[PDB]
Design a protein around this ligand. Sequence first.
Ligand SMILES: *[C@@H]1O[C@H](CO)[C@@H](O[C@@H]2O[C@H](CO)[C@@H](O)[C@H](O)[C@H]2NC(C)=O)[C@H](O)[C@H]1NC(C)=O
Ligand SMILES: *[C@@H]1O[C@H](CO)[C@@H](O[C@@H]2O[C@H](CO)[C@@H](O)[C@H](O)[C@H]2NC(C)=O)[C@H](O)[C@H]1NC(C)=O
Ligand SMILES: *[C@@H]1O[C@H](CO)[C@@H](O[C@@H]2O[C@H](CO)[C@@H](O)[C@H](O)[C@H]2NC(C)=O)[C@H](O)[C@H]1NC(C)=O
Ligand SMILES: *[C@@H]1O[C@H](CO)[C@@H](O[C@@H]2O[C@H](CO)[C@@H](O)[C@H](O)[C@H]2NC(C)=O)[C@H](O)[C@H]1NC(C)=O
Ligand SMILES: *[C@@H]1O[C@H](CO)[C@@H](O[C@@H]2O[C@H](CO)[C@@H](O)[C@H](O)[C@H]2NC(C)=O)[C@H](O)[C@H]1NC(C)=O
Ligand SMILES: *[C@@H]1O[C@H](CO)[C@@H](O[C@@H]2O[C@H](CO)[C@@H](O)[C@H](O)[C@H]2NC(C)=O)[C@H](O)[C@H]1NC(C)=O
Ligand SMILES: *[C@@H]1O[C@H](CO)[C@@H](O[C@@H]2O[C@H](CO)[C@@H](O)[C@H](O)[C@H]2NC(C)=O)[C@H](O)[C@H]1NC(C)=O
Ligand SMILES: *[C@@H]1O[C@H](CO)[C@@H](O[C@@H]2O[C@H](CO)[C@@H](O)[C@H](O)[C@H]2NC(C)=O)[C@H](O)[C@H]1NC(C)=O
Ligand SMILES: *[C@@H]1O[C@H](CO)[C@@H](O[C@@H]2O[C@H](CO)[C@@H](O)[C@H](O)[C@H]2NC(C)=O)[C@H](O)[C@H]1NC(C)=O
Ligand SMILES: *[C@@H]1O[C@H](CO)[C@@H](O[C@@H]2O[C@H](CO)[C@@H](O)[C@H](O)[C@H]2NC(C)=O)[C@H](O)[C@H]1NC(C)=O
Lengths: 160, 160, 160, 160, 160, 160, 160, 160, 160, 160, 160
Amino acid sequence: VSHLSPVHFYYRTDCDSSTTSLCSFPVANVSLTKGGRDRVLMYGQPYRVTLELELPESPVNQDLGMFLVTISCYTRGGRIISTSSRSVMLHYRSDLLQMLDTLVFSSLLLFGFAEQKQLLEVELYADYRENSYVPTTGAIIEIHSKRIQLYGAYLRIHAH
Amino acid sequence: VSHLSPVHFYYRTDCDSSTTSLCSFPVANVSLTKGGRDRVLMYGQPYRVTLELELPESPVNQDLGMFLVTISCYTRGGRIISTSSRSVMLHYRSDLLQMLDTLVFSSLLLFGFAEQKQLLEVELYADYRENSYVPTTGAIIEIHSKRIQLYGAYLRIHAH
Amino acid sequence: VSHLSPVHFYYRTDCDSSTTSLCSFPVANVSLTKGGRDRVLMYGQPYRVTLELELPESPVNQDLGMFLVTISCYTRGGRIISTSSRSVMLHYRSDLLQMLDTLVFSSLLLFGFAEQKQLLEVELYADYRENSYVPTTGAIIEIHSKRIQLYGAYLRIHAH
Amino acid sequence: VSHLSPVHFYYRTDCDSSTTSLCSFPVANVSLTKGGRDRVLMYGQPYRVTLELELPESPVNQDLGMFLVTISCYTRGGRIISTSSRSVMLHYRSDLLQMLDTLVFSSLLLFGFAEQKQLLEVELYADYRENSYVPTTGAIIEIHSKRIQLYGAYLRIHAH
Amino acid sequence: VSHLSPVHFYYRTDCDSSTTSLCSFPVANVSLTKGGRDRVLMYGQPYRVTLELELPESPVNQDLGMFLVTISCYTRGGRIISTSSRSVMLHYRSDLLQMLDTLVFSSLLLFGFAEQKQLLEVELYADYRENSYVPTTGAIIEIHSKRIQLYGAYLRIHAH
Amino acid sequence: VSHLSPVHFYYRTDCDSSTTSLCSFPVANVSLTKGGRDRVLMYGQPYRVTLELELPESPVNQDLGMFLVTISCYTRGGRIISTSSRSVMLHYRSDLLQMLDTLVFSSLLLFGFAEQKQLLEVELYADYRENSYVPTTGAIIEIHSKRIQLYGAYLRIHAH
Amino acid sequence: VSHLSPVHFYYRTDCDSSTTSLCSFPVANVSLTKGGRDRVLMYGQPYRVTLELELPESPVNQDLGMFLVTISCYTRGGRIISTSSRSVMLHYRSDLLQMLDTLVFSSLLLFGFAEQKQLLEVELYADYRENSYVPTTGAIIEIHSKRIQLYGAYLRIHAH
Amino acid sequence: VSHLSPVHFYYRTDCDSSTTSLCSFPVANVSLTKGGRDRVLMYGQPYRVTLELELPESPVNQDLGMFLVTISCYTRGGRIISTSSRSVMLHYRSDLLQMLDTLVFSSLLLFGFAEQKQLLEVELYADYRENSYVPTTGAIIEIHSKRIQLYGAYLRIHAH
Amino acid sequence: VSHLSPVHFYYRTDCDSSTTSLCSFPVANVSLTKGGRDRVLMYGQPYRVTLELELPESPVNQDLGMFLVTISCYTRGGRIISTSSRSVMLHYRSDLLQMLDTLVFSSLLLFGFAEQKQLLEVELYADYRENSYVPTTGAIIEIHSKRIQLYGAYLRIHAH
Amino acid sequence: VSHLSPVHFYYRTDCDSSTTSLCSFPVANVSLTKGGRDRVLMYGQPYRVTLELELPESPVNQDLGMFLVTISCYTRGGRIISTSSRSVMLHYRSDLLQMLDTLVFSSLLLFGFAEQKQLLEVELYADYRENSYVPTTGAIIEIHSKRIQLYGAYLRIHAH
Amino acid sequence: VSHLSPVHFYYRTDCDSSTTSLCSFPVANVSLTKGGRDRVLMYGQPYRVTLELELPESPVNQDLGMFLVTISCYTRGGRIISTSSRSVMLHYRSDLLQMLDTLVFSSLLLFGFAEQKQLLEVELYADYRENSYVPTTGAIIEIHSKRIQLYGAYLRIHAH
Ligand SMILES: *[C@@H]1O[C@H](CO)[C@@H](O[C@@H]2O[C@H](CO)[C@@H](O)[C@H](O)[C@H]2NC(C)=O)[C@H](O)[C@H]1NC(C)=O
Ligand SMILES: *[C@@H]1O[C@H](CO)[C@@H](O[C@@H]2O[C@H](CO)[C@@H](O)[C@H](O)[C@H]2NC(C)=O)[C@H](O)[C@H]1NC(C)=O
Ligand SMILES: *[C@@H]1O[C@H](CO)[C@@H](O[C@@H]2O[C@H](CO)[C@@H](O)[C@H](O)[C@H]2NC(C)=O)[C@H](O)[C@H]1NC(C)=O
Ligand SMILES: *[C@@H]1O[C@H](CO)[C@@H](O[C@@H]2O[C@H](CO)[C@@H](O)[C@H](O)[C@H]2NC(C)=O)[C@H](O)[C@H]1NC(C)=O
Ligand SMILES: *[C@@H]1O[C@H](CO)[C@@H](O[C@@H]2O[C@H](CO)[C@@H](O)[C@H](O)[C@H]2NC(C)=O)[C@H](O)[C@H]1NC(C)=O
Ligand SMILES: *[C@@H]1O[C@H](CO)[C@@H](O[C@@H]2O[C@H](CO)[C@@H](O)[C@H](O)[C@H]2NC(C)=O)[C@H](O)[C@H]1NC(C)=O
Ligand SMILES: *[C@@H]1O[C@H](CO)[C@@H](O[C@@H]2O[C@H](CO)[C@@H](O)[C@H](O)[C@H]2NC(C)=O)[C@H](O)[C@H]1NC(C)=O
Ligand SMILES: *[C@@H]1O[C@H](CO)[C@@H](O[C@@H]2O[C@H](CO)[C@@H](O)[C@H](O)[C@H]2NC(C)=O)[C@H](O)[C@H]1NC(C)=O
Ligand SMILES: *[C@@H]1O[C@H](CO)[C@@H](O[C@@H]2O[C@H](CO)[C@@H](O)[C@H](O)[C@H]2NC(C)=O)[C@H](O)[C@H]1NC(C)=O
Ligand SMILES: *[C@@H]1O[C@H](CO)[C@@H](O[C@@H]2O[C@H](CO)[C@@H](O)[C@H](O)[C@H]2NC(C)=O)[C@H](O)[C@H]1NC(C)=O
């Protein structure tokens, strides 16, 4: 099986008034290993995490070329065990094809069904292991772009 | 059951004349635990608060990418017991689809029925508890964007 | 029953020539408790005041995002007894829907019937009381925006 | 009955060449209590003055948001007895409705009948009295906007 | 009966080259009490002078909002006996109505009949008297706007 | 009878290169009292001079609002006997009416007949006399605008 | 009879590179009294010279408002006997009439016949005499505008 | 046979907020010679590596003219054995042909099939050898353009 | 008879890079009196030289208003015998007539026949003589405009 | 026979971020005389090398007027034996003809066949010889333009 | 007979990055008198060289007004024997005629036949001789414009 867990971002906005950009890089503590012993296995069949990220097709969202989502797993304390990084790219469409998309699919979009989202999927620990039997408590995921608009984020951990 | 309570914002505007933006971050004391003992339970079935927020599709409102709504529960005095934060995103639509929306639904919008609102819903204490039996008097909710246009706000506290 | 009373604004304009904005915040002494003893009751059924405010759909009027209307009740002298504040928002419409509004309703608007007004209503003492039996003489209502265009204002005090 | 009296404005224009604006605030001595004893009564049925003001729909006239017309009644010498103030607003119309107005009513406007005026009416001593039996000689009415275009002005004093 | 008399303006233009404006305020000595004793009567039926002024609808002429025409009557020497002042306003029309005016009335305007003039009429001594039996020789009429285009001017003195 | 006489202007152009304007005010000595005794009479029936001036409808010519044509009659030497001044105005037409004028009258204008001139006529010694029997030799006529385009000028002296 | 003589202009262009304008005023020695005694008569029937000048309707040529062509007759040496001056004006046409001119007359202009010239004619010694019997050798004609485009020039001397 | 291996880029973004460009050159450690002895052969049939690179037709992506992808093979430690370099060019199309491409292929692109990618292929060790029998552990591939948008990258090693 | 001779221009271009203009005035030694005694006659029937100049209707070529072509005949050494000067003007056409010219004559211009040239002809020694019997070797012709585009030039010497 | 050999360019890009241009001139070592004795002959039938260069019709590529491709043959060491240079020009087309090209050939271009390339061919050793019997190892070819977009390059050496 | 010989230009481009212009004047050594005695004759029938130059109709090519191609023949060493110079002009066409040219001839231009070239021909030694019997080795031809786009150049030497 494979249980997900929601990701909730935050960022400070201590600084002054901007135009549209944020003030810092959006980080997120995700949490895992809840009160029951149902977590990443001791030496299980190896894991394939994917950060199922969500994006709308804003014009602003469209401009940003690439942004790398990193990760770091912590164990007990401020104790990193493994890091990674994956660049990712918002999946491009032309302008004429967006006009034909919002004109052909005008029957679905005007009634709630399958709204204009473009949900990504970026795997970043293909064949993950948990060595030396120190338990992985959670992760600190972090995207490095001050100008990004995203609804929410899921984190699939998955077996094989 | 689940009773709501209205949220009334305020902000200072002590400063000089702006273009369209506000002068500070819109905060709000909500109030709870009224004269009858009908409040957040002692150790009840756990709570799921949602801040049902209201937004119109202004152009100005549309530009702002993300804004994080925070919360802080106070007990007796200036005594925080729990905080949180959720980023949230105004739900995007394209311009051609807005033209088709205000052209197809021209029979409903010109007669009061289901006007151009885009009411959000952002849960921020999924499975809330009230530990150590100090009573929660109310909350101080606060959105961190000086440029935001919103009608009103409800605060569902809800059981399971 | 429920008697209203008209509100007449004023503001100084001592300063130099502006473009369109005013010179100070529009305040207004409303007056109550006239020569007969027909005023806010001693311990009556509690009151629900609404400041029925009037606005035209100017472009200028449309730009302003939010503005908070405050209130302060005075008793005898410069003696405040209760204050409040409510932010309020001019009720948004798109531009294409305004073109369809002034095109579909061209039979009513060209003959005086139901002209292009957008009268607000903002309650600000839902369940008002008059405690310690000091009489409320009137109110000082005040909107905090130097750039606002409004015809007039009524003040419903209402029973239950 | 109710007799009116015409109002004739003046203002100095001592200053240099402007673009379109005036040089000072348009004041006007109106005059009353003529050679026969037909004036504001001693203790009559109380009065309701209205300053029936006249305005054309210039673009320039349209921009100005609000302007407060004041008043001051003088008795014998430079002796004020009563003052007031009323803000007033030029009654708004959209641009598309002005095009439909000057297109639908093209049969009346091209032959003199009911030309493009927008005559206001602003009451400013609803239930006026004349106390202590010092006679009111006239009034000094005054509008506080250097940029205003108006044909003429009548001053209804009216009984009940 | 009522005899008129033509008014001939002048102004200095001593100053340097302007764009379109004049150099000073257009004044005019009108003259009266010619070689026969046919002038303003000793104690006649009282007079109502009107300065029938002439204006074309030039764009430059159209911009100017208000201008006050004054007057001063002289007796024998530089001896004023009476002054006045009346603001006056060029009678407004919209642009679409000017297009319909020069399109509908294309049969009259292209053959000399009733050309595009907009002759004003501004009364400024309604019920004029000539007291103390010092004879009024003439008048010095004067309009206070450096940017005005006008053909000519008549001065009706009229009986009752 | 009434004999005319042509007027020939001149002006210096000593100064540097301009855009379109002239360098000084266009003056003109006209001449009269030729070798035969046929001139302004001794005490004749009084005269009415008109300076029949000629103007084309150039855009540059059209902008100029008013210009005053003066006059001065000289007798023997540099000896003025009488002066005057008349403001005058180029007779206005709109742009749409000029398009209809050059479109409707396209049969006359393309073959020489009645070309696009706008000849003025400005009387400036209505009931002229020649007192003290010093003979009037001629006149010095002069228009005060550095930016004016005119073909020629006739000077009617006329009897009654 | 009446013999003409061609006029050939020249001007220095010593100065630096301009945009379109010339460098000095175009002067021209014309020459007369050739090897046979056929010149301006001793006391002949008086002469009427006209400088038949030639102009194309270039836009640059069209802008220039007025320009005065002068003249000076020389006798033997640098010895002026008579001068004059005539202002002259390029004969105006509108733009719509130029479009109709080059559209209606498209059959003549595309085959050489009567090309787009606008030849002037300006008389400048109407009733010329040759007094004191000093012979007039020729003339120095001169137009005072640095920005003028002209093909050629004839000089009619003519009898009566 | 021929096994591929995925390439994952990274780059620092330590620097401040840019417009669209990156902060450094995108490098990538690829890895090879896994836990089984299936790697580049000792003296095998020689190899032909191709870096199958992926690009979308973004306007930003389209501007960049050429960019050289380099390579360096490392053995054991920071020990380069072989380098290369190949310039490469995004395969050009005109704008009218892109409009015809997204109009003709509108049936395939609106349903997921064969989306607007332009996957390159650039061979850079045509006839590769592994001399002196020091094993090649992996490669450090690197493209030298700070402004490039690319999804992913495969690295074919291939036999003959 | 009348023999021509080709003219070959030159000019230095020593100076730096310009936009379109040349660097000096285009001069040309033409040559005459070849090895046979066939040149300008001793006292022949007098000559009429014309410099048949060639011009294309380039926009740049079209702007230049006038340019004077001079001449100087040399005899033996640097020995001028006669000079002249003629201003000349490129023969004007309007823009609408150029569109009708290149549209009506589209059958001739697209096949080589009578291409868009505008060959001038400017006579500059009408009735030329060769006095004192010093032989004229050739001429130095010279046009004074740094911005001129011309193909070639012929020089007709012609008898009568 | 005639064997070709591929050319692989490189250039440094050490410098900072440009707009579109490169950082240095694109040079290339080509290599020849491989492990078998099949190279440029001792005294063979003479050679005709052509550098078959490849170019796309970018707008950017189109602007560059001329660029000279040079060459230098090296023998053993840094030892040049022969150099050359040929300017070359991208083969021009108009814009309307490019629109007709990508519209008429829309059946071939949308399916891979004969894509929008413009492959040049520039011979630069027509009748090449290899004198003094020092062997030519290869060549260093080099194009001198920092702003050029090219896919690849072949180098035909060819016999006769 | 008449043999030609190809001309190969070169120019330095040592200087920095330009926009489109070159860095120096394009010179070219042409070469003649090859290994067989077939060159310019001793005293042959005289020669007529033409430099058949090649030009495309770029917009850039079109702007340049005139450019002079020079020549210099060298004999043995740096020893000039004869020089010349001819200005030349790119043969003008209008823009509307270029649109009709690339529209009418769309059948020839889209298939390779007679592409958009405008090959010049400029003779520069009409009746060339080779005096004093020093042999002419070749020529150094040179065009003086830094902004010129040309494919190639032939040099006809021709007999009579
Ligand atoms: C993000 O990670 C965790 C989970 O939210 C938190 O870190 C805590 O750090 C202390 C440090 O001594 C340790 O007890 C644990 O690592 C965490 N606490 C608990 C109770 O698990 C914190 O929210 C964030 N940490 C950082 C470093 O940002
Ligand atoms: C928002 O929260 C409450 C409710 O409106 C108010 O805070 C009061 O703070 C005093 C401090 O001693 C305490 O008595 C209670 O916490 C509150 N008073 C009552 C009567 O409950 C106040 O309006 C706001 N407080 C802050 C800190 O902003
Ligand atoms: C607005 O409120 C009242 C009503 O118009 C006025 O205030 C007066 O203040 C004096 C101060 O001593 C007191 O007698 C009463 O409070 C008011 N007077 C009366 C007769 O009721 C005044 O107009 C305004 N006051 C302020 C403070 O702005
Ligand atoms: C406006 O009001 C009146 C009426 O026009 C005038 O004021 C006069 O002031 C003197 C001062 O002593 C008094 O006699 C009366 O108040 C007025 N005169 C008469 C004859 O009634 C004057 O025109 C204006 N006054 C001011 C102050 O502006
Ligand atoms: C314009 O007026 C006259 C006519 O052209 C000229 O003035 C002359 O002035 C002298 C001065 O003594 C007098 O003899 C006459 O007034 C005029 N001369 C003759 C012969 O009549 C002159 O052209 C101009 N005068 C001025 C002052 O501008
Ligand atoms: C223009 O006028 C004449 C004719 O072209 C020339 O002037 C000569 O001036 C000398 C001066 O002593 C006199 O002999 C004659 O007036 C003229 N010469 C002859 C032979 O007639 C000259 O070309 C020009 N003069 C000026 C002053 O510009
Ligand atoms: C990229 O290459 C390798 C593989 O990711 C890593 O380099 C390591 O460098 C150390 C240096 O002593 C050596 O042990 C090996 O070369 C590599 N380590 C292992 C375990 O193989 C590193 O990630 C990157 N190296 C550089 C220089 O960027
Ligand atoms: C233009 O004119 C001639 C012909 O091309 C040349 O001038 C030579 O000048 C010398 C000076 O002593 C004289 O022998 C002759 O006038 C000319 N030479 C011959 C052989 O005729 C020269 O090309 C040019 N001259 C100038 C002054 O520009
Ligand atoms: C380009 O040319 C060659 C071939 O790639 C290389 O030059 C080497 O230079 C050394 C110098 O002593 C000599 O051994 C040979 O000329 C070349 N080496 C071999 C093994 O042939 C080098 O790549 C480049 N050279 C230059 C000068 O850029
Ligand atoms: C252009 O002309 C020739 C041919 O290409 C070359 O000039 C050489 O100059 C030397 C100088 O002593 C002489 O031997 C000959 O004039 C030429 N050499 C040979 C072998 O003929 C050179 O290429 C160029 N010369 C100049 C001056 O640019």
